[PDB]
Design a binder for this molecule. Sequence first.
Ligand SMILES: Nc1ncnc2c1ncn2[C@@H]1O[C@H](COP(=O)(O)OP(=O)(O)CP(=O)(O)O)[C@@H](O)[C@H]1O
Ligand SMILES: O[C@H]1[C@H](O)[C@@H](O)[C@H](O)[C@@H](O)[C@H]1O
Ligand SMILES: [Mg+2]
Length: 273
Amino acid sequence: MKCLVVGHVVRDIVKKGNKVLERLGGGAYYSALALSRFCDVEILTSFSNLPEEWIKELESMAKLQVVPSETTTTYELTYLDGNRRRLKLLERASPIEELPDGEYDVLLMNPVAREVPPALVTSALKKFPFVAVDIQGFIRSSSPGEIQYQPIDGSFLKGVKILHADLGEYQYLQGFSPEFVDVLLLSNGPEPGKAFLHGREYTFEPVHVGVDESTGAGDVFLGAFTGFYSQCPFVQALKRAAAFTALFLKNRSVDFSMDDVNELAMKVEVKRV
Ligand SMILES: Nc1ncnc2c1ncn2[C@@H]1O[C@H](COP(=O)(O)OP(=O)(O)CP(=O)(O)O)[C@@H](O)[C@H]1O
Ligand SMILES: O[C@H]1[C@H](O)[C@@H](O)[C@H](O)[C@@H](O)[C@H]1O
Ligand SMILES: [Mg+2]
């Protein structure tokens, strides 16, 4: 199984109380990280400078296809509480305007700052047989500074197999209903989420875990779900995605056994409404 994940990798400047660190980030990184546990991954991205050790982490999990750039997408993430963060765009890498040809079983589009046009999703749906999308990088302004949401028309998503948005983001998706996609994952941090299978609503309860930051969890959840959904029934896939993302949150290396994911997946509550 061979997957292409599309989006900018990000230099995260992460601020948590009085502490400051830098770390690799981005939808494409975190979704690839999760999918690396299921198949061969290639990442189509753009960046200019990254730390040698970060290029090494990315290359140990995937093949990189990098659109040349003078700049690296850089986000300051100021976490007031564990899930609540202010996101500020400080710098942005190049647009991703061209897809590669190849035997890609799955394409997962996870931009973070408007680098993938909706036209490219349209092109992907024609060139490839299975498209997954996170909406986050389609509804943020690309303008410098504090992120602002701009609504978009959602008819271009018709044909997408799996779509993830959080509660707040979903409100910015207009002309949309869940049946446009095969699976709509509507998350809400540690709080109950929704999942829709051909429009049919379910609820799900994440397992409780105490985080100081949530960075990447929605990307991991989307990537993990995409992986399990290819090998499990819908409900089980959703449980295992949840457990996977719970484990990730306390083990960002994601080097835990898949057996550990399966045992904990059983304790995850899922109901057809
Ligand atoms: N505090 C927490 N405890 C346990 N699971 C959590 C969690 N926060 C997130 N998760 C899991 O990850 C999923 C996606 O998280 P979330 O809804 O926060 O993604 P997001 O894209 O909206 C923002 P972020 O990537 O910063 O988390 C949740 O549905 C849940 O299963
Ligand atoms: O590292 C992160 C993470 O990948 C988020 O899911 C994304 O929305 C942010 O912009 C990025 O800084
Ligand atoms: Mg997200």
